[PDB]
Amino acid sequence: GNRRIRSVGEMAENQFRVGLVRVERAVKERLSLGDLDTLMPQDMINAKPI
Amino acid sequence: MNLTELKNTPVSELITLGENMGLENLARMRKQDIIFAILKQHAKSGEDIFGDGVLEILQDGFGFLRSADSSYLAGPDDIYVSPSQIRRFNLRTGDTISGKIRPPKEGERYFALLKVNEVNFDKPENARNKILFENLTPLHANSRLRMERGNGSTEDLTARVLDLASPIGRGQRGLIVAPPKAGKTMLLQNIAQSIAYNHPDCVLMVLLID
Numbered sequence A: 001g002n003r004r005i006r007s008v009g010e011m012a013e014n015q016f017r018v019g020l021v022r023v024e025r026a027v028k029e030r031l032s033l034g035d036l037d038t039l040m041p042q043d044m045i046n047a048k049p050i
Numbered sequence B: 001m002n003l004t005e006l007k008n009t010p011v012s013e014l015i016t017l018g019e020n021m022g023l024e025n026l027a028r029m030r031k032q033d034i035i036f037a038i039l040k041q042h043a044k045s046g047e048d049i050f051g052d053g054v055l056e057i058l059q060d061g062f063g064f065l066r067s068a069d070s071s072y073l074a075g076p077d078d079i080y081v082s083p084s085q086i087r088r089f090n091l092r093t094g095d096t097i098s099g100k101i102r103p104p105k106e107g108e109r110y111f112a113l114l115k116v117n118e119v120n121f122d123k124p125e126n127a128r129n130k131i132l133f134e135n136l137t138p139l140h141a142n143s144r145l146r147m148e149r150g151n152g153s154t155e156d157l158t159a160r161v162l163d164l165a166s167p168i169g170r171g172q173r174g175l176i177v178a179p180p181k182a183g184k185t186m187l188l189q190n191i192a193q194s195i196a197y198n199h200p201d202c203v204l205m206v207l208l209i210d
Ligand SMILES: Nc1ncnc2c1ncn2[C@@H]1O[C@H](COP(=O)(O)OP(=O)(O)O)[C@@H](O)[C@H]1O
Pocket: B155, B158, B179, B180, B181, B182, B183, B184, B185, B186, B187
């Protein structure tokens, strides 16, 4: 009742969330200088960290 | 700051400006990196940069805007334009661009484009929906190019004889078949002079290869 079991599901979810917050900090630091109508939401996020 | 004022100015005024800005010893390097450092300093203390040139798209995806006086050569003076502009405005190789540009940070060294203003001396809205070059329908020349100036100088008679032997018009192909030692350089010079004096509305371009 006090011990909780975790599976591949929420473990992978937490790992993906860590990757997501990392790339979110990255894209926010990059976005602090970006302007309007000069980019697409494709190269703003890098797939390599995920 | 505009680019052409610093491009077509003599290098002496550039040396004076770089010495007045309190910079490194400027006269010890190329004109290219001289004007590059001058623009960098003026951007560090000043407003946005205003550049212009002709666009070349490589096989890489991005584009380089190069100036006319350097015969469109690589160097620090080129302007990097991302493929995002080539996707938005649907740019093409050889597009005469002029607009706002910014200085580079780490990882970059070329001035990145901020916002285009004039594309081939035309508004981007008018240039968006246009007609391709090869899609046009060629035809024969109808408007004859008058090469006689009317003053009758000592050498303009050459052009006169030209009008006597080869009536040139808008859309004609001219092949000057001449061995060396024959005096075609001043001939082409006088032709250009006359065609700019009589028809100053049409653009005139010359190309000296080898
Ligand atoms: N219309 C002209 N009047 C006087 N001299 C001329 C004329 N056209 C050519 N020449 C002479 O011919 C020479 C041609 O020199 P150059 O330009 O090197 O030959 P090319 O044009 O065949 O390369 C010049 O030195 C010039 O003195």
